[PDB]
Amino acid sequence: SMLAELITSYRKSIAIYTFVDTGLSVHFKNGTYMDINELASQYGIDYSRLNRLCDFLIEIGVLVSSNDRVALSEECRVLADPESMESLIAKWEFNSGLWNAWLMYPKSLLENNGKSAFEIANGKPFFEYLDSNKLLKSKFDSLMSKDSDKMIEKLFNVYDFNQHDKILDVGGGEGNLLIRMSEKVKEKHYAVLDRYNELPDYGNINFIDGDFFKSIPSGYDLYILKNVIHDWPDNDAILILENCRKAMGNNATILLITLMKKPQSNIIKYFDILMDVSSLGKERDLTEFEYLANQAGLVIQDVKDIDESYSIIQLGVK
């Protein structure tokens, strides 16, 4: 039945996770056809068990078959590229911490104690958990950087970054937004604020180890908040925006790069439940963003679509 299919859908996700995690995926570049017997021998996997996994991946349209040889389907070819968005999701999404968070979604709803399903499952908030696991953080950080890679060209078209001299990426992680930005937009003071166990290095980017709940570095004319605000409950989001307001000058800009609840967005509902489970975060409409801005002592000056899901919100001091 349709309902039976929905309940067992998670097995499709796990089949893809397994294909990548085993190291098999990177042998299927450019829709090339592989002998399963050969792969099984190389990796010391039982042929029959590997063939049964491939049969399932054929059934769900990830693999195609021809003369006892298997290739990635046209739509799933990106899975052979380890730097593809889909590969980076497959290498992050199924980490034991986030996987177990989902089981505590019901408990997190019934308790209503300000603890996310993730914190109930793992005994630590999401970003504390990442702070304690270097390899898992690099997998998350890599996925976030790929999001900046996919958006930078769309971003240039909707906002003139060249009008700014000093730019701070607030919660910028690896700082890939500014790395990509620095390729077209030259002779700027580029800086990134995040939580770092070790400060990263890249060109003349000023990486600052800090905490946007405590303070925001002053003296920047542009403050960028990309995929930050949706992580946080209202009060936490207001504190970040308020710390930004107190740090910034009267002629300075805050630019939110954010998913926004718009009429057509299936994808925002998937992010909404992920944000809830991960950190009691949420996706917001323009009215909810207006509320955050007003509470923080800011005003929205401009709103523009980056694409169907993503938008820029330009704020100044009220």
Q: CB 193 → ligand SAH: shortest distance, Å?
A: 6
Q: Name the active-site residue from 27, 164, 189, 230.
A: 230
Kindly indicate which of the ranges 84-92, 131-139, 154-162, 219-227 contains the residues binding its own copies, using the contact rule CB under 8 A: 84-92
- Give Cα separations from 83 to 114, 145, 153 (angstroms): 36, 10, 18
Which is nearer to ligand SAH, 25 or 258 (by Cβ)? Answer: 258
Kindly indicate which of the ranges 81-89, 138-146, 189-197, 296-304 contains the residues binding its own copies, using the contact rule CB under 8 A: 81-89
Residue 272, contacted partner among ligand SAH, Na ion, its own copies, none, CB below 5-8 A by kind: its own copies
Tell me the backbone φ, ψ of residue 161, rounded to 5 degrees: -80, -20
> What are the tokens at 35?
């002998």
- Give the per-residue contact string, 35-74, with its own copies (x = CB under 8 A; - = no): --------xxxx-xxx-xx-xx--xxxx------------
- Which residue minimizes CB distance to ligand SAH? 171
CB-based contacts of 59, cutoff 8 Å, min separation 6: none
Kindly list the residues in this chain that would bind ligand SAH in the complex (CB under 6 A). Answer: 127, 144, 147-148, 171-173, 193-195, 210-213, 226-228, 231
Which is nearer to ligand SAH, 108 or 145 (by Cβ)? Answer: 145
Q: CB 106 → Na ion: shortest distance, Å?
A: 30
Is 230 a known active-site residue? yes
Q: CB 279 → ligand SAH: shortest distance, Å?
A: 9
The neighbouring-strand residues paired with 194 are 209
Interaction residues for Cl ion, span 250-289 (CB under 5 A): 276, 280, 282
CA distance linking residue 292 with residue 239, whole number of Å: 9
Q: CB 233 → Na ion: shortest distance, Å?
A: 23
**Among positions 28, 70, 171, 172, the unique one binding Na ion when judged by CB under 5 A:** 172
Q: What string of H, E and C letters represents the secondary structure of the chain?
A: CHHHHHHHCHHHHHHHHHHHHCCCHHHCHHHCCECHHHHHHHHCCCHHHHHHHHHHHHHCCCEEEECCEEEECHHHHHHHCCCCHHHHHHHHCCCHHHHHHHHHHHHHHHHCCCCCHHHHHHCCCHHHHHHCCHHHHHHHHHHHHHHHHHHHHHHHHHCCHHHCCEEEEECCCCCHHHHHHCCCCCCCEEEEEECCCCCCCCCCCEEEECCCCCCCCCCCCEEEEECCHHHCCHHHHHHHHHHHHHHCCCCCEEEEEEECCCCCCHHHHHHHHHHHHHHCCCCCCHHHHHHHHHHHCEEEEEEEECCCCEEEEEEEEC
* Residue 287 sits in the site that holds its own copies (CB under 8 A): no
Residue 144, contacted partner among Cl ion, its own copies, ligand SAH, none, CB below 5-8 A by kind: ligand SAH
**Among positions 19, 108, 169, 244, the unique one binding Na ion when judged by CB under 5 A:** 169
Residue 135, contacted partner among Na ion, Cl ion, its own copies, none, CB below 5-8 A by kind: none
Which is nearer to ligand SAH, 40 or 188 (by Cβ)? Answer: 188
| CB distance 190 to 181 below 8 Å | yes
Catalytic residue numbers?
Answer: 230
Where along the sequence are the contacts to its own copies (CB under 8 A)? 1-4, 6-18, 21-22, 43-46, 48-50, 52-53, 55-56, 59-62, 75-76, 78-79, 85-86, 89-90, 93-94, 96, 99-100, 102-103, 105-106, 109-110, 112, 266-267, 269-270, 272-274, 276, 280, 282
The residue ranges that bind Na ion (CB under 5 A) are: 169, 172, 175-177
